[PDB]
Amino acid sequence: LFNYIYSLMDVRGKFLFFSMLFITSLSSIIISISPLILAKITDLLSGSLSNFSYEYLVLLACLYMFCVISNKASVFLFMILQSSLRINMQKKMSLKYLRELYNENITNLSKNNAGYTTQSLNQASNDIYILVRNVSQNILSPVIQLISTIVVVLSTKDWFSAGVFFLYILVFVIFNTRLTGSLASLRKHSMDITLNSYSLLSDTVDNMIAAKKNNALRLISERYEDALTQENNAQKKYWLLSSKVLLLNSLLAVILFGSVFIYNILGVLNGVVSIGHFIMITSYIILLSTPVENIGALLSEIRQSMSSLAGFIQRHAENKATSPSIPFLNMERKLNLSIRELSFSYSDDKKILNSVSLDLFTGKMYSLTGPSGSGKSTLVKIISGYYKNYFGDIYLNDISLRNISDEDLNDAIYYLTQDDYIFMDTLRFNLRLANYDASENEIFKVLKLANLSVVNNEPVSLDTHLINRGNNYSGGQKQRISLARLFLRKPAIIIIDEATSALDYINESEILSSIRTHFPDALIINISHRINLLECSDCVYVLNEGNIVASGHFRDLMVSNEYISGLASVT
Amino acid sequence: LFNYIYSLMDVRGKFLFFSMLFITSLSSIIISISPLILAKITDLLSGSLSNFSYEYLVLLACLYMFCVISNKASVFLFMILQSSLRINMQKKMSLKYLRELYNENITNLSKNNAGYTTQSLNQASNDIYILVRNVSQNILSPVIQLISTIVVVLSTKDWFSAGVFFLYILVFVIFNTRLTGSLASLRKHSMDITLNSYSLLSDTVDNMIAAKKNNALRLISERYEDALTQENNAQKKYWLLSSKVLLLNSLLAVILFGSVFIYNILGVLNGVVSIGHFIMITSYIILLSTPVENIGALLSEIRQSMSSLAGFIQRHAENKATSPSIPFLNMERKLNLSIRELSFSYSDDKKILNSVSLDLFTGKMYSLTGPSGSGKSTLVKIISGYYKNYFGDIYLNDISLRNISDEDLNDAIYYLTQDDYIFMDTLRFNLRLANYDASENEIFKVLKLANLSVVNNEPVSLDTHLINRGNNYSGGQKQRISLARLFLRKPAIIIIDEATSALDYINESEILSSIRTHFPDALIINISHRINLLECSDCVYVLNEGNIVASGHFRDLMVSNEYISGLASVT
């Protein structure tokens, strides 16, 4: 946990922290002499008061002031160094999640929305900054100011004060650490529900168009008001208990340090305690409020932030990629396919796939028809690397798919959906998304073969913008955007699913053969009921509610079974 | 601006602020007596020192301590009252944007993503809280502590100190207010680029699936690193200048208050100034650092937060809805249609619509065919209430569409798209989105007519969840979800666009006639090239690249023009 925080510090990052560590711990020394200086200032007024006993008052006045100026200017140096550190430990932090999300599975990206992660990352940098505000300052600065006090009073031989001052620190730690336990899980849940409070704003602001079109303003507001009060009442539970802990600790200061002020004020009127000794003991308590309270700031803030930070390490940083079965993917390409007894359970309630023992061999065109999405559209999604809640193993040239990590898996297995994923930027962006190694020459080359170079009988520029959810291009052009990424990249096993729903023959002839042209040694798989696409194939499969039922050519399936016979009569 | 901040305070909200105002302004009084108490403590040590001149030292010691305890415990009461206020001024703030977004146009929702608003609202509650931290505390608390100082020193007749103490406050305001001007627009831009820094994370985390599938990890990281440094360097420009302003103001304290400490320390060694008078003047400067610095906190924090808060009022709170042309919508329904010379300019570069003078009359079925999306799909979107960058007026029973506000406009004009807008919750949620007045009885009633009640020959429960971007249901079922909202609501002018792209005759016969059944007096408009849907119509229109070209029946258009003749030959 600690290493991940210190990892954010680069060259300048590690240089400003040690600067922060010294400067703050230096101010503690100069401020510890401060009560002792005024004691000898006060004592001096009852002295002989000759030539040098009026110049000493002047001297020590500056000596006390300098100590204040030094510790004063030290905090401004502390909040300038940290403000410089705030920038440096944000740059190398923003990507330390971006890249963590990339390598993590879709099963943890489908259940997380845009606004969720906007706050999930917001609380991480919020807690680490607070953890630095405690690791640097509150670790040494109070400790140095507190130890001086214990011995100084023990040295001047005021044993009671030397006891009670130690007893407050003795009690204060036990009281806080025991209570922090729940306060931590309460700030945890408070931030966890605060997380969920904006997990709904994400779904709100995105689909507000429909809400405006259906006018359920109240539902939008009321559903949001429900989570809002779920947060407030969970924040009440924490604030209440946190505030109640204060009145306890602050009462103790009046209990212990109040009685010490009483103790010495009694002994001073007699003659057991001098004016200065009394003045020093009261001024010590006066300057004992600063370390005592900042010791508390350490104990709590560190623990509650560490628990709310722990809910960021045990989910994204492994055990998804341990750098294990990175092998292999053949370099001459061609990897075939072999599935043996595939079974899925989404919500456990039913069996998606029952028994699937199939073997496919690369370099030829295959097809998947029958009862629509009964387990044919999903079968290839588990293969492509969406879910790992399946049974058996999917072998691809001596290697099962459950073994290969998602970084090497997507290099050979490229899958085309109906639901295309387009960004909110230039044409170049989405095209260079398939490859950063492909520059302007091959980019415009893939465009003429992706049937989107010349749109409305006029060539499209590469700086042409695109609006969110594919709001810039039509139903047919949204699918052809998903097609440009295919020719720009180079896979070994290609899968196609009902992406020929928003396309016609004048453009379906120039696309279905170009895949065979560019990728001939590859394993092309298509999932579209069209008879003209089911005929070009070397092998056709029928998938009824999960289990495999038929296989072979189109001319044998339209004679043997009656679905392919009742699909070939609708031409 | 100020009224919108005070509006957040309800009954308990307005009660805790006045509690905050008194308690903080009360601590300023007790702390102003503090330097004067120690002055008479110090002076007393050079006195006659009889019976009552050792009991007075004891008395004033408590009197000084109580003053510290009072001001000390006052800050904990201040940060407990504000922590209570933080909850109360968040509940009535979260919706004070949710509802502001609802009434605002799509043209300001298409250009704003989920993560943008997650931070656009985050900085609003961040600046108001800071503004309360200045309006309550820093308005009175320093002012009371500062005025006492001016007269006390003027009363004790130390005219120089009474001058220089006033001169620092005289200079400090002019220095800060002149420099704040740019610092405000720099924190503005800093927060504006910080806004834009996460405007890309929204597009990143949402479409990470494609990035993982196309492996452009570097591009994702590098594009994010580009905005990250665009932020850091814009944050550098602010921090640098802000930090440079400190070393100036803090030098002035050593320039002015340093020389006053020198002034009196010179006059004390002589006999012009007594021990106590000197001790009080030094202790005043000592306790003058607290109001002076907190006066600065007011001057700046208020101005920079007010400018970064101003960029939240002049965009959402009007001039979209002034409560003007709320009239009318006929109660017996039937409102007809009348467009006169419609023209659009998206990027100005071209003319989307050239000349459109058309009149439609309610109670009958209409159609729009021809060259796909050439201005036929967009024509109805400007009508439905998407854009106001058009020419002319669209009259609907003596009222032009440019006049009716979007709240009354969506009640009669309901439009069905291909791109459906589904949420991330239960079946009930999306269904009750069309109406909150419709309970369980009519909800299940619309389901059997929306062809989604009995899915896979098994009835679907109303607590059935749905995954983001329609990831739970298929291409055909995503369109039929958009259809249930139609029968659940009651419009006067219905528009349909290529939503019959992912549907077949066994379900297209049970839907196309049910709209005529449920809404007969309504103006049904369809935009689908299908000949069977173009025949049922009372009037068909042809739309070529913006301008109107043909109108009339299907049997006259398939004889007169050659497109409808070359569309009716493909059956």
mmCIF file of N, CA and C in Angstrom, chain A residues 498-544:
data_model
loop_
_atom_site.group_PDB
_atom_site.id
_atom_site.type_symbol
_atom_site.label_atom_id
_atom_site.label_comp_id
_atom_site.label_asym_id
_atom_site.label_seq_id
_atom_site.Cartn_x
_atom_site.Cartn_y
_atom_site.Cartn_z
ATOM 1 N N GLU A 498 -24.370 -10.320 -36.958
ATOM 2 C CA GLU A 498 -25.509 -9.550 -37.494
ATOM 3 C C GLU A 498 -25.178 -8.054 -37.763
ATOM 4 N N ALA A 499 -23.963 -7.808 -38.312
ATOM 5 C CA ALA A 499 -23.428 -6.496 -38.690
ATOM 6 C C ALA A 499 -23.815 -6.180 -40.143
ATOM 7 N N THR A 500 -24.471 -7.168 -40.793
ATOM 8 C CA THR A 500 -25.029 -7.121 -42.146
ATOM 9 C C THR A 500 -26.589 -6.925 -42.028
ATOM 10 N N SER A 501 -27.037 -6.191 -40.950
ATOM 11 C CA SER A 501 -28.441 -5.831 -40.633
ATOM 12 C C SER A 501 -28.790 -4.451 -41.231
ATOM 13 N N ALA A 502 -27.794 -3.525 -41.232
ATOM 14 C CA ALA A 502 -27.884 -2.160 -41.764
ATOM 15 C C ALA A 502 -26.926 -1.953 -42.989
ATOM 16 N N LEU A 503 -26.961 -2.897 -43.980
ATOM 17 C CA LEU A 503 -26.155 -2.883 -45.222
ATOM 18 C C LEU A 503 -26.875 -3.618 -46.409
ATOM 19 N N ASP A 504 -26.539 -3.212 -47.667
ATOM 20 C CA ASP A 504 -27.091 -3.726 -48.938
ATOM 21 C C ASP A 504 -25.984 -4.305 -49.871
ATOM 22 N N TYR A 505 -26.390 -5.114 -50.894
ATOM 23 C CA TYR A 505 -25.565 -5.861 -51.867
ATOM 24 C C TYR A 505 -24.482 -5.047 -52.626
ATOM 25 N N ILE A 506 -24.746 -3.769 -52.998
ATOM 26 C CA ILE A 506 -23.797 -2.911 -53.753
ATOM 27 C C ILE A 506 -22.504 -2.650 -52.909
ATOM 28 N N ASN A 507 -22.632 -2.711 -51.562
ATOM 29 C CA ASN A 507 -21.553 -2.511 -50.587
ATOM 30 C C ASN A 507 -21.221 -3.819 -49.808
ATOM 31 N N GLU A 508 -22.145 -4.820 -49.800
ATOM 32 C CA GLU A 508 -21.982 -6.130 -49.133
ATOM 33 C C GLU A 508 -21.126 -7.102 -49.984
ATOM 34 N N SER A 509 -20.958 -6.795 -51.295
ATOM 35 C CA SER A 509 -20.138 -7.568 -52.234
ATOM 36 C C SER A 509 -18.674 -7.096 -52.166
ATOM 37 N N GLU A 510 -18.475 -5.784 -51.943
ATOM 38 C CA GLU A 510 -17.182 -5.112 -51.838
ATOM 39 C C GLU A 510 -16.528 -5.288 -50.443
ATOM 40 N N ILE A 511 -17.279 -5.837 -49.447
ATOM 41 C CA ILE A 511 -16.828 -6.041 -48.056
ATOM 42 C C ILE A 511 -16.618 -7.546 -47.715
ATOM 43 N N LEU A 512 -17.578 -8.429 -48.070
ATOM 44 C CA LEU A 512 -17.523 -9.862 -47.753
ATOM 45 C C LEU A 512 -16.378 -10.606 -48.445
ATOM 46 N N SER A 513 -15.910 -10.103 -49.602
ATOM 47 C CA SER A 513 -14.808 -10.694 -50.367
ATOM 48 C C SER A 513 -13.449 -10.069 -50.002
ATOM 49 N N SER A 514 -13.437 -8.791 -49.557
ATOM 50 C CA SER A 514 -12.221 -8.068 -49.171
ATOM 51 C C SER A 514 -11.580 -8.666 -47.912
ATOM 52 N N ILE A 515 -12.401 -9.280 -47.033
ATOM 53 C CA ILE A 515 -11.962 -9.951 -45.800
ATOM 54 C C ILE A 515 -11.217 -11.233 -46.208
ATOM 55 N N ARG A 516 -11.721 -11.923 -47.248
ATOM 56 C CA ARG A 516 -11.093 -13.117 -47.821
ATOM 57 C C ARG A 516 -9.819 -12.722 -48.583
ATOM 58 N N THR A 517 -9.795 -11.488 -49.135
ATOM 59 C CA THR A 517 -8.673 -10.927 -49.888
ATOM 60 C C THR A 517 -7.527 -10.592 -48.919
ATOM 61 N N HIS A 518 -7.779 -9.673 -47.967
ATOM 62 C CA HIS A 518 -6.806 -9.213 -46.978
ATOM 63 C C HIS A 518 -6.388 -10.303 -46.002
ATOM 64 N N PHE A 519 -7.353 -11.096 -45.502
ATOM 65 C CA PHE A 519 -7.082 -12.141 -44.517
ATOM 66 C C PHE A 519 -7.537 -13.516 -45.062
ATOM 67 N N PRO A 520 -6.702 -14.166 -45.905
ATOM 68 C CA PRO A 520 -7.100 -15.462 -46.484
ATOM 69 C C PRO A 520 -6.795 -16.668 -45.585
ATOM 70 N N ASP A 521 -5.626 -16.672 -44.911
ATOM 71 C CA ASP A 521 -5.173 -17.738 -44.007
ATOM 72 C C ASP A 521 -5.973 -17.713 -42.686
ATOM 73 N N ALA A 522 -6.724 -16.620 -42.439
ATOM 74 C CA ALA A 522 -7.520 -16.409 -41.229
ATOM 75 C C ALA A 522 -8.827 -17.226 -41.211
ATOM 76 N N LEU A 523 -9.338 -17.483 -39.983
ATOM 77 C CA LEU A 523 -10.568 -18.214 -39.649
ATOM 78 C C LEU A 523 -11.771 -17.242 -39.604
ATOM 79 N N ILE A 524 -12.397 -16.958 -40.769
ATOM 80 C CA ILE A 524 -13.531 -16.024 -40.858
ATOM 81 C C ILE A 524 -14.816 -16.733 -40.401
ATOM 82 N N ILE A 525 -15.514 -16.139 -39.408
ATOM 83 C CA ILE A 525 -16.772 -16.636 -38.839
ATOM 84 C C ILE A 525 -17.830 -15.560 -39.002
ATOM 85 N N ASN A 526 -18.990 -15.926 -39.551
ATOM 86 C CA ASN A 526 -20.104 -14.997 -39.738
ATOM 87 C C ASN A 526 -21.361 -15.515 -39.040
ATOM 88 N N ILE A 527 -22.149 -14.595 -38.464
ATOM 89 C CA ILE A 527 -23.401 -14.902 -37.772
ATOM 90 C C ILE A 527 -24.471 -13.969 -38.362
ATOM 91 N N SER A 528 -25.079 -14.417 -39.468
ATOM 92 C CA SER A 528 -26.126 -13.717 -40.213
ATOM 93 C C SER A 528 -26.931 -14.754 -41.012
ATOM 94 N N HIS A 529 -28.258 -14.800 -40.768
ATOM 95 C CA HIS A 529 -29.233 -15.737 -41.353
ATOM 96 C C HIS A 529 -29.341 -15.677 -42.900
ATOM 97 N N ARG A 530 -28.757 -14.642 -43.559
ATOM 98 C CA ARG A 530 -28.811 -14.444 -45.017
ATOM 99 C C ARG A 530 -28.248 -15.664 -45.768
ATOM 100 N N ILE A 531 -29.080 -16.234 -46.684
ATOM 101 C CA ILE A 531 -28.840 -17.435 -47.517
ATOM 102 C C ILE A 531 -27.632 -17.269 -48.466
ATOM 103 N N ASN A 532 -27.433 -16.052 -49.015
ATOM 104 C CA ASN A 532 -26.335 -15.699 -49.922
ATOM 105 C C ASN A 532 -24.964 -15.741 -49.199
ATOM 106 N N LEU A 533 -24.948 -15.473 -47.867
ATOM 107 C CA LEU A 533 -23.757 -15.484 -46.997
ATOM 108 C C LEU A 533 -23.516 -16.880 -46.402
ATOM 109 N N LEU A 534 -24.596 -17.670 -46.274
ATOM 110 C CA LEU A 534 -24.634 -19.037 -45.752
ATOM 111 C C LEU A 534 -24.235 -20.067 -46.823
ATOM 112 N N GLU A 535 -24.219 -19.643 -48.108
ATOM 113 C CA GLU A 535 -23.879 -20.463 -49.275
ATOM 114 C C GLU A 535 -22.376 -20.404 -49.608
ATOM 115 N N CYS A 536 -21.745 -19.202 -49.483
ATOM 116 C CA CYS A 536 -20.316 -18.947 -49.747
ATOM 117 C C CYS A 536 -19.416 -19.770 -48.802
ATOM 118 N N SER A 537 -19.942 -20.092 -47.603
ATOM 119 C CA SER A 537 -19.302 -20.823 -46.508
ATOM 120 C C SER A 537 -18.922 -22.267 -46.844
ATOM 121 N N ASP A 538 -17.853 -22.747 -46.176
ATOM 122 C CA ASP A 538 -17.327 -24.107 -46.260
ATOM 123 C C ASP A 538 -18.060 -24.994 -45.256
ATOM 124 N N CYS A 539 -18.566 -24.390 -44.155
ATOM 125 C CA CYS A 539 -19.308 -25.086 -43.104
ATOM 126 C C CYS A 539 -20.289 -24.138 -42.396
ATOM 127 N N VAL A 540 -21.547 -24.595 -42.232
ATOM 128 C CA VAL A 540 -22.639 -23.873 -41.566
ATOM 129 C C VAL A 540 -23.038 -24.639 -40.301
ATOM 130 N N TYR A 541 -23.349 -23.917 -39.210
ATOM 131 C CA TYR A 541 -23.772 -24.519 -37.941
ATOM 132 C C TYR A 541 -25.128 -23.990 -37.499
ATOM 133 N N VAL A 542 -25.927 -24.851 -36.851
ATOM 134 C CA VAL A 542 -27.239 -24.492 -36.305
ATOM 135 C C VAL A 542 -27.109 -24.561 -34.771
ATOM 136 N N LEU A 543 -27.518 -23.486 -34.070
ATOM 137 C CA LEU A 543 -27.413 -23.388 -32.614
ATOM 138 C C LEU A 543 -28.782 -23.146 -31.958
ATOM 139 N N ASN A 544 -29.366 -24.217 -31.377
ATOM 140 C CA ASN A 544 -30.678 -24.191 -30.724
ATOM 141 C C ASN A 544 -30.561 -24.113 -29.189
#
